[PDB]
Design a protein around this ligand. Sequence first.
Ligand SMILES: Nc1ncnc2c1ncn2[C@@H]1O[C@H](COP(=O)(O)OP(=O)(O)OP(O)(O)=S)[C@@H](O)[C@H]1O
Lengths: 239, 54, 220, 107, 240, 230, 191
Amino acid sequence: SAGFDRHITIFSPEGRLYQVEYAFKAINQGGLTSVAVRGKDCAVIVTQKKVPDKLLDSSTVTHLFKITENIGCVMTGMTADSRSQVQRARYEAANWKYKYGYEIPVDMLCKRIADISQVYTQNAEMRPLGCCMILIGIDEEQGPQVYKCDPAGYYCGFKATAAGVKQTESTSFLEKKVKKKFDWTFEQTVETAITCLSTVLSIDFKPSEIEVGVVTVENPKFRILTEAEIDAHLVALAE
Amino acid sequence: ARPDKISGADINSICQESGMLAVRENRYIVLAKDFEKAYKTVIKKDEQEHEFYK
Amino acid sequence: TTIAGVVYKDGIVLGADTRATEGMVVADKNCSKIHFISPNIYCCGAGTAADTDMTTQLISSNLELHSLSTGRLPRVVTANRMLKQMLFRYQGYIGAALVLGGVDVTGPHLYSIYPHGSTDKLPYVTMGSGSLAAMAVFEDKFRPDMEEEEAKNLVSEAIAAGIFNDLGSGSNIDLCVISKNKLDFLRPYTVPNKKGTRLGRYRCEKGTTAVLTEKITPLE
Amino acid sequence: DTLDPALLRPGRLDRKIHIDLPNEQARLDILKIHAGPITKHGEIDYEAIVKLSDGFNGADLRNVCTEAGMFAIRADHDFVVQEDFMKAVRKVADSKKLESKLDYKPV
Amino acid sequence: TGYDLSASTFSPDGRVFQVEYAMKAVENSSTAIGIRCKDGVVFGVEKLVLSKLYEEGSNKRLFNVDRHVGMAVAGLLADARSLADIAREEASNFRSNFGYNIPLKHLADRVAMYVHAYTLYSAVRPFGCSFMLGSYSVNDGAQLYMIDPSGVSYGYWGCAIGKARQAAKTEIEKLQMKEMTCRDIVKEVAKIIYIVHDEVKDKAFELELSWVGELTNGRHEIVPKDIREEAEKYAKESLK
Amino acid sequence: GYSFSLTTFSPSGKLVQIEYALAAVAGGAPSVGIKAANGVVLATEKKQKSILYDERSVHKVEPITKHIGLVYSGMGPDYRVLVHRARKLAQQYYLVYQEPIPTAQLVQRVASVMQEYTQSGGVRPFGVSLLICGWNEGRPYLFQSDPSGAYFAWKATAMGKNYVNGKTFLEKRYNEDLELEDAIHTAILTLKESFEGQMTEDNIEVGICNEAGFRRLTPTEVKDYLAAIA
Amino acid sequence: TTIMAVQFDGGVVLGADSRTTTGSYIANRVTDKLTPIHDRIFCCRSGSAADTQAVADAVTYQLGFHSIELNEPPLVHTAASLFKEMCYRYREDLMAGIIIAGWDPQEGGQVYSVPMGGMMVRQSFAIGGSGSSYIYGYVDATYREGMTKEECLQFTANALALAMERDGSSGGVIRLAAIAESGVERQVLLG
Ligand SMILES: Nc1ncnc2c1ncn2[C@@H]1O[C@H](COP(=O)(O)OP(=O)(O)OP(O)(O)=S)[C@@H](O)[C@H]1O
């Protein structure tokens, strides 16, 4: 194997490189879980908080980052990479708005962030920002979108999406759950998000630990939920 | 009639996989359950890891 | 040069006149002033010809690049923003009197650009040297939500008045119609001015000119 | 670290299995069985030792019981008070943090 | 244990040992705490004289970045001085470009991006600093943030930076922090710093206290600690 | 333990970091491309990892202009980069000459770019082998490039897993003279020789190049065609 | 041409003519002379057109990016400062009569004025445009401190009416904008 001690980004024998596949668990040192779901004309993010301290605040532990007025996102991995990635995303959305006269679609933003990660990957002597990014947004003539951006620069985007620590199990539940052809009437979406995290982690906890970000084609603005309505949905899914 | 190539050691592992997987349920022979369980256990999903760079 | 633009009930009908004068002598009788931008957006130019040409080819290249990068149909406002940013970046040195028109998902959108970078969205514009006559015909006989043949007759009338006023064209007024689905482009629309037939055969003969030194060079 | 792929074939290791650390309620299990041979009052906060310590080892809870018993030997008491348990939390969970390379799985 | 050389390379388990070594660099530094009240933020730094060679009034780690913002650094001192100058420059850009006082969230985010930019490349090392940031505003209240050597910046009510990081916040959190004005919190910080390490390993230390809030009308300055002398007449009553 | 890095030759052999990139290409997803009499057919093999993924977001078969198709066998994150380079470069040619760029000139310039990344000494090569095609001046073409900067010209070839096996089928099955539909038939045959068992309207992704222009087929006509094409 | 901004207790009220001219020929008969930047902040322009369009677009860029990074609604004085810096930096090439107004949650309705030089001042009312001298003649005659919304609408209606009637460049039709805590209410009047 290596052998080559994988110190820089080169090609090893047979045939892979080891830097990016060490960066793929820099997410796993975060100790954090993210789940995205697209069923219908809405889209739901759910992500917990790990606050052991009562001296620590609760408002500024939010991982849901409102990128633009119609685009939210969530971050995992280490925090500094995530926040720097977030300000680059905001900056490039504003650059779109300056150059092209209209609001950026969520696809081009994921493409641009991935390309930046590839330039940080193609040329050496910079750390390749080991954080993963999930985006959501509403588009005309396409409904909602959910995308994932890799630290490697591999974007894709799809219906039921999960990244973090325990998401082989989450994608196992989302294969075992998105196989039945029912519609997704927005509380089905919220219920499936809450219960999928509640079955992967198996905690069944207060409404004050998870963060819920939704966007809907009734209010295309990105929207962060309050403790009261999170509690309302949580006991509304309690059977 | 299936492709997704499976070698002789892999075939015998599927057969013993399925046979043990039914007898541990205290049965007589597999009723086609554990053959498809042996597929969806044994393939075994091209690894996980990495689905980047293909 | 008298270009015009209008918005009927679905799209945009553009017209042009193709006399490219260089100073005081008619240098051309057929000059394409209606330029390509995209499958849905076109443009007309006025004033300095080569500036409009190079600029419209650059912006059409950039929008082709952007549209193939995106994967859907371009927007007119992006073309407007690129053009006004470029023309303001040249500080009004480049004289390019542009009419911008296209049909997006939102529908038809017409823009006129004055060469410093001041732009306007209008239901009808006229640009060029004899634009005043076409604007007379527009302000006389415009009504909102015209039909197709009505709008074509109106634009033809306007450019015809620009031609019967000074610095129009000998040309057979060019038209172009953009809809939600059907793009058309019509060069020899109406030829009002037939050239008078020659009255004598002032044809030279086989040897009427003294030749000093001949040469023949064969080829393949 | 170095193991055979032919070790890893069905027929010699036909089934294999995984174990989590605790699931934080197996923490409660290992504590409630580690809360065995200890003279006390019956007031020992299991939630405080479960959540406040992070050892993820029955041997770590063994050290917890041992040093809490030593801190009942200290100050001369037959009973191990809950504060001796939190002294064990502090000292044992800090000496616990003198370790690197906390991960092991072959292949 | 590696692979610990560059700040760009990863480990076989996925973390940067340079950043870790810089995080535990600040662990040997002096203990510096901070806490906010409902109308202000109070700083306090356990500062030690070397032996008898100081002047009691040099090299004060309580900086003062903007008119209403100052630092409470701990770690390598000169690196913190450079970072304080960078923060002064950023507040300068904001004041020059927008005509009003910098919000503390945006300042902290710019500083966190600057620290992260020194953690990224291989030419440079990560910072060996960990500092506190306080403010006050009439439309915003009191805000207390916190920046690690890596660049993770979020908010607290109270914090501590130094050796007794745990051993201060064990009894910081038993304060009824909301219902108190900061003039109580002054002697509270005095008693908290005075609790930790009276004479055991070192010989003598000395207290500095910074002070921002509504009582300063939006200003940030050191307390007149000699006025009301609230540590020692209560510190000598805190030994029993 | 040598070579390391990109600046120095071996004792006798070649540039091992280019050899490893070629091996990383050969370890990639399979593909096949066939030059017929009138058109060129490209076909890839696009498996989602889970049942969650969407087949409408990422596209393998990709046009560079309206008449030039292009596929790869490697890594998408580099593929998109050199795609964008080829886009901007082809549009620069069309600015200069007001004429659609010939495919040979594309392959020259893309090869110059890839060669420039193979130049010393801090950047790695692409892990991507292209298959470029187009219908320029009547005669259609087919051009394979590689990470090393080289390029070739094929009648039919393959790249990815079992490119050798697919090539031995291509040598046997294909010939010089067919039409585009028979080319698609033998192309789906040689991809079905080597791909996984579930091959649907979405696991493959096929674009053609008529002389009338490039065309990227839809899952509608792919499902109509691959509804047990043989 | 002739632009006007009047604040009142609840909010502010703007107003302009349309009539973009070049020399003695009217190039455009109807024009959005006032421009949205934020959802609560407008600006109305004069002088050259392209200058003000490019400046307003760049201010829209910087202010939108800044206000997203604050995650708070922006101030009006902030946008006035942005216009001040960009106007003053290129006073050599720009001709801007930018007047910033807009409601704010912290400070209510405010009106700032930036003339062709690059100075910035807060005012209770403002004129602007080449045909503004006349209603600047009587805006210190008819004004009364503490108007209502309807009094401001009638006031600016009479103002822009007389300015449009007298000045040759001014004319066209009256466009209004009302900015308060509740919403932005635009309408097109004539009379
Ligand atoms: N033709 C076949 N029919 C049935 N079972 C087969 C056949 N070929 C192989 N097998 C099975 O696969 C095994 C092949 O022998 P192996 O023990 O796998 O050889 P191996 O030594 O492990 O591989 P190497 O290369 O020699 S290390 C047999 O024991 C059978 O279980």
